[PDB]
Design a protein around this nucleic acid. Structure first.
Ligand SMILES: [Mg+2]
Ligand SMILES: [Mg+2]
Ligand SMILES: [Mg+2]
Ligand SMILES: [Mg+2]
Ligand SMILES: [Mg+2]
Ligand SMILES: [Mg+2]
Ligand SMILES: [Mg+2]
Ligand SMILES: [Mg+2]
Ligand SMILES: [Mg+2]
Ligand SMILES: [Mg+2]
Ligand SMILES: [Mg+2]
Ligand SMILES: [Mg+2]
Ligand SMILES: [Mg+2]
Ligand SMILES: [Mg+2]
Ligand SMILES: [Mg+2]
Ligand SMILES: [Mg+2]
Ligand SMILES: [Mg+2]
Ligand SMILES: [Mg+2]
Ligand SMILES: [Mg+2]
Ligand SMILES: [Mg+2]
Ligand SMILES: [Mg+2]
Ligand SMILES: [Mg+2]
Ligand SMILES: [Mg+2]
Ligand SMILES: [Mg+2]
Ligand SMILES: [Mg+2]
Ligand SMILES: [Mg+2]
Ligand SMILES: [Mg+2]
Ligand SMILES: [Mg+2]
Ligand SMILES: [Mg+2]
Ligand SMILES: [Mg+2]
Ligand SMILES: [Mg+2]
Ligand SMILES: [Mg+2]
Ligand SMILES: [Mg+2]
Ligand SMILES: [Mg+2]
Ligand SMILES: [Mg+2]
Ligand SMILES: [Mg+2]
Ligand SMILES: [Mg+2]
Ligand SMILES: [Mg+2]
Ligand SMILES: [Mg+2]
Ligand SMILES: [Mg+2]
Ligand SMILES: [Mg+2]
Ligand SMILES: [Mg+2]
Ligand SMILES: [Mg+2]
Ligand SMILES: [Mg+2]
Ligand SMILES: [Mg+2]
Ligand SMILES: [Mg+2]
Ligand SMILES: [Mg+2]
Ligand SMILES: [Mg+2]
Ligand SMILES: [Mg+2]
Ligand SMILES: [Mg+2]
Ligand SMILES: [Mg+2]
Ligand SMILES: [Mg+2]
Ligand SMILES: [Mg+2]
Ligand SMILES: [Mg+2]
Ligand SMILES: [Mg+2]
Ligand SMILES: [Mg+2]
Ligand SMILES: [Mg+2]
Ligand SMILES: [Mg+2]
Ligand SMILES: [Mg+2]
Ligand SMILES: [Mg+2]
Ligand SMILES: [Mg+2]
Ligand SMILES: [Mg+2]
Ligand SMILES: [Mg+2]
Ligand SMILES: [Mg+2]
Ligand SMILES: [Mg+2]
Ligand SMILES: [Mg+2]
Ligand SMILES: [Mg+2]
Ligand SMILES: [Mg+2]
Ligand SMILES: [Mg+2]
Lengths: 100, 146, 63, 202
RNA sequence: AACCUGGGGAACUGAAACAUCUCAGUACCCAGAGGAGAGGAAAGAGAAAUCGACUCCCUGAGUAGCGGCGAGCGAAAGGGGA
RNA sequence: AGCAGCGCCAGAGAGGGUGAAAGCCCCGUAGGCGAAAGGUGGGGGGAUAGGUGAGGGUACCCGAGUACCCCGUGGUUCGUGGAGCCAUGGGGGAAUCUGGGCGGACCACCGCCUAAGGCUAAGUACUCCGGGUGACCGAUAGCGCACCAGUACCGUGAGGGAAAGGUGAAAAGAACCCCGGGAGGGGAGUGAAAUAGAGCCUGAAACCGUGGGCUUACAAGCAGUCACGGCCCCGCAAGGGGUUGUGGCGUGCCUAUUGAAGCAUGAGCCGGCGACUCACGGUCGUGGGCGAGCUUAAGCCGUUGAGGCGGAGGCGUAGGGAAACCGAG
């Protein structure tokens, strides 16, 4: 509960810092930390790997989660605050003026 | 006129003294110096001679008390007819207390200094002297009875 | 919290409208015997105090 | 002083007043000091060696131990121990003589008039509680927003308007008080209020 | 937890010793009550042919009085309030 | 998010967060809406239990080991006092309104009230609990506990009772090579920064060390100071800094004392903790408001860091006397 926010698995712009500007599908949202994942901060883990299984495990420059606040959702007009509007039955989220 | 300088009036200067210092008031306290300068001293007004007090003097106050004590009894408030001149109309217990110089003191007694303005002045008692003062220029009406 | 008046003093000392402190003279209640008329006549009246007079007033308070 | 600017549709009709002439600088202070002490919460407390937790067991013999004589760990020489003359909570209020409060109110409002900044108004065209309206009314009124303003008014909607403006201090008429008056640059008040200010004194 | 009521109930200490007195009906022990507990519709007040249950605050008042009349202790009625 | 440019919102410019300093990014804020279920709920409504008349006669009833009296005590402002009132351990022991109790011994008068059965909301007290706010603390503070604390540990036991918070924006937590058994390091790498590298922000002092400058093995010392001189260093020089050779001078600090370098007290050293406060009431002084006046207390209304109402009451305007009383005396 309450832990909910800005977006979810979908499409998003990053008004952040390093990746200020970039846009991308949020392949991840973890609310316990308040952090999403797009394709922005993606830094390098020199690490072999933690668990011995699967010998090699990757220097992978994997996708470093973001403060869920540095990303904004987006439509025809890109990057808008979200409004919540009620249909005739449910709750769908209109945007700064558009919808979806 | 703003919060800068509506400041205190060049002299209400709050400034308590501090006795831990090194220069001012120092090893000892504000004063001190010695011993029996610690947590207290016997009184020292009324009390400590160290000896037989200067209540060598002696109760005269005949009628100090009695178990049930104070005896209710009509007390009279002296008001001069010099502070009477202060107005014109019909001066009465109600009035002198209603504003000024009576104050619930069950009984009005006009008396004494000043010159009497010719007028009615009800009260519970007058001065042999003040009865004159005004009786020689106006109405003296006396207290209640029943 | 509110000093209490000192009843012992109340019971034996008046503070005069100017500010003096009056007491009955000591010495007139049984040392008595043969003492001049003067002696015990003189003892009959009130006197005025001094430095303890100030000590005195401190007690008689709401008084 | 005397002639104070009034507003209405029909224009500036500068009406007069009977506010003091002399401003006791000090007295204002006395009142502002007072408004500010009475508004305190007592709230700061600390534990004497009494309220502190530790047992009272005298910590050692005090003899032939050859450590320094001691009682309980509660004692303030001890770290963790109880505080000495640390603050208990308390009432900071005092009753400033009414007459003094009154003088001050006058003199405050007084001060601001002689300067010029006092403006009684009326033509509150700022219909409903919508900043943008009062913002407009403020414009065509000589309230650039450049100077701090204590709007005093009965009109709760006018109140609603000014509210969220950083340069403004809305406040019902009876709320008039000297800290606030001085606290600010311009005094602007509804005539219905300056009437009630004249009630408390006029 | 604390608050409350009843049964029981200290001493240091103060009095510049101390015993009455004080500390204090406090500390504590015990029984009970509860969202409170007590008190409560006059065999009352106390001096006005007056008031009109009870409880709480302001006041009365450090007054009335109590007191090895020491140290100290310390009301009520009435008045303003809830 | 700073600076700049041009905009907008505001019943919302409380506050928090986001890589630093954001009304407009995020969570909020103002304003406004919501309960099937459980709890609460006379505030509104309804109903039931109950309740309400006037005169005359009658003298039936109106709370018993009770009133009352005495002995012993308690409560009260009341300490045996002139000692009532209320309460009651012991003894005696009534009446039913021609009854009884009280109004401070007692009596007479006048007046008040109806004991010896019980119940009664509100106003009041408190704070384990939830929330809001702070001229409240900021890890030796604040609760004993910000941390896995009533723990560890200590006591047979009652019981006592600690210490211990902080990488970074993100773990990106340092692959890989090298020396080493490891630890730990050196490179490489990440990071804005790694003397931010993992009890890792800042990182003071005591304390230990390495390098450099001046200095010291015929010299006497509260360890410094004054002078001159040599050396080293900064500046073009006039100058300054460091060091100390010789000469002059020179009895630590605090405490306590007639008197301390004192062979009197205290102190290994450093860091942090550590002692004249507040409340009420007095009394002087002082800044100010008002003035023969001045001032409100609880509280009520307002607000939600707005004030106002509230004269009960207090101080003052008359003193003197033990008092009755009299009164500028
Ligand atoms: Mg941004
Ligand atoms: Mg002492
Ligand atoms: Mg002697
Ligand atoms: Mg005088
Ligand atoms: Mg004679
Ligand atoms: Mg008095
Ligand atoms: Mg204790
Ligand atoms: Mg403990
Ligand atoms: Mg030792
Ligand atoms: Mg503490
Ligand atoms: Mg209690
Ligand atoms: Mg003693
Ligand atoms: Mg003693
Ligand atoms: Mg003593
Ligand atoms: Mg008890
Ligand atoms: Mg219960
Ligand atoms: Mg309640
Ligand atoms: Mg109850
Ligand atoms: Mg009961
Ligand atoms: Mg009855
Ligand atoms: Mg009763
Ligand atoms: Mg009647
Ligand atoms: Mg004696
Ligand atoms: Mg007592
Ligand atoms: Mg109330
Ligand atoms: Mg109340
Ligand atoms: Mg514009
Ligand atoms: Mg901000
Ligand atoms: Mg809903
Ligand atoms: Mg609702
Ligand atoms: Mg109710
Ligand atoms: Mg009906
Ligand atoms: Mg019926
Ligand atoms: Mg009949
Ligand atoms: Mg009996
Ligand atoms: Mg009797
Ligand atoms: Mg007794
Ligand atoms: Mg008795
Ligand atoms: Mg006795
Ligand atoms: Mg009797
Ligand atoms: Mg009996
Ligand atoms: Mg009688
Ligand atoms: Mg009779
Ligand atoms: Mg709480
Ligand atoms: Mg709380
Ligand atoms: Mg605190
Ligand atoms: Mg701690
Ligand atoms: Mg620590
Ligand atoms: Mg805790
Ligand atoms: Mg053990
Ligand atoms: Mg790792
Ligand atoms: Mg390495
Ligand atoms: Mg390799
Ligand atoms: Mg091996
Ligand atoms: Mg390791
Ligand atoms: Mg840095
Ligand atoms: Mg560093
Ligand atoms: Mg390590
Ligand atoms: Mg380490
Ligand atoms: Mg270091
Ligand atoms: Mg060098
Ligand atoms: Mg040599
Ligand atoms: Mg050098
Ligand atoms: Mg020595
Ligand atoms: Mg020594
Ligand atoms: Mg010694
Ligand atoms: Mg030390
Ligand atoms: Mg030693
Ligand atoms: Mg004081």
């Amino acid at each position: 509960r309450v832990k909910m926010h800005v977006k979810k698995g979908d499409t998003v712009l990053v008004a952040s810092g390093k990746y200020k500007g970039r846009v991308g599908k949020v392949k991840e949202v973890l609310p316990k930390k308040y952090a999403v994942i797009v394709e922005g901060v993606n830094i390098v883990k020199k690490a072999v790997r933690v668990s011995p299984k699967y010998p090699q495990g990757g220097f992978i420059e994997k996708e470093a989660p973001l403060h869920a606040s540095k990303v904004r959702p987006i439509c025809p007009a890109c990057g808008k605050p979200t409004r919540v509007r009620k249909k005739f039955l449910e709750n769908g989220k209109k945007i700064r003026v558009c919808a979806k | 006129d703003l919060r800068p300088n509506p400041g205190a009036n060049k002299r209400r200067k709050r400034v308590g003294r501090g006795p831990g210092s090194g220069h001012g008031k120092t090893a000892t306290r504000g004063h001190k110096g010695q011993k029996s300068r610690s947590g207290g001293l016997k009184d020292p007004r009324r009390f400590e001679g160290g000896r037989s007090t200067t209540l060598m003097r002696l109760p005269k106050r005949g009628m100090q008390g009695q178990v049930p004590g104070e005896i209710k009894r009509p007390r009279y408030q002296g008001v001069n007819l010099k502070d009477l001149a202060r107005f014109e109309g019909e001066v009465t217990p109600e009035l002198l207390v209603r504003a000024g110089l009576l104050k619930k003191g069950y009984r009005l007694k006009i008396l004494g200094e000043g010159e009497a303005k010719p007028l009615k002045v009800v009260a519970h008692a007058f001065s042999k002297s003040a009865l004159e003062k005004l009786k020689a220029a106006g109405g003296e009406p006396v207290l209640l009875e029943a | 919290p509110k000093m209490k008046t000192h009843k012992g003093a109340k019971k034996r000392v008046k503070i005069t409208a100017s500010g003096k402190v009056v007491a009955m003279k000591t010495g007139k209640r049984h040392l008595n015997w043969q003492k001049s008329g003067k002696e015990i006549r003189q003892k009959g009246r009130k006197f005025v105090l001094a430095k303890p007079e100030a000590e005195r007033i401190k007690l008689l308070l709401p008084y | 002083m005397y002639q104070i600017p009034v507003l209405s549709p029909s224009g500036r009709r500068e009406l007069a007043a009977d506010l003091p002439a002399e401003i006791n600088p000090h007295l204002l202070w006395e009142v502002v000091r007072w408004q500010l002490a009475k508004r305190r919460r007592g709230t700061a407390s600390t534990k004497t060696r009494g309220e502190v937790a530790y047992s009272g067991r005298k910590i050692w013999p005090q003899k032939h131990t050859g450590r320094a004589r001691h009682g309980d760990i509660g004692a303030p020489i001890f770290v963790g121990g109880g505080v000495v003359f640390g603050p208990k909570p308390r009432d900071y209020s005092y009753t400033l003589p009414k007459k003094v409060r009154k003088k001050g109110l006058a003199m405050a409002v007084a001060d601001r008039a002689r300067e010029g900044k006092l403006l009684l108004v009326e033509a509150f065209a700022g219909v409903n509680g919508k900043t943008k309206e009062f913002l407009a009314w403020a414009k065509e009124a000589g309230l650039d927003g450049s100077e701090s303003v204590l709007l005093v008014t009965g009109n709760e909607l006018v109140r609603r308007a000014a509210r969220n403006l950083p340069w403004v201090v809305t406040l019902a008429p009876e709320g008039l008080n000297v800290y606030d008056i001085v606290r600010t640059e311009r005094l602007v008040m509804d005539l219905d209020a300056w009437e009630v200010f004249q009630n408390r004194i006029g």
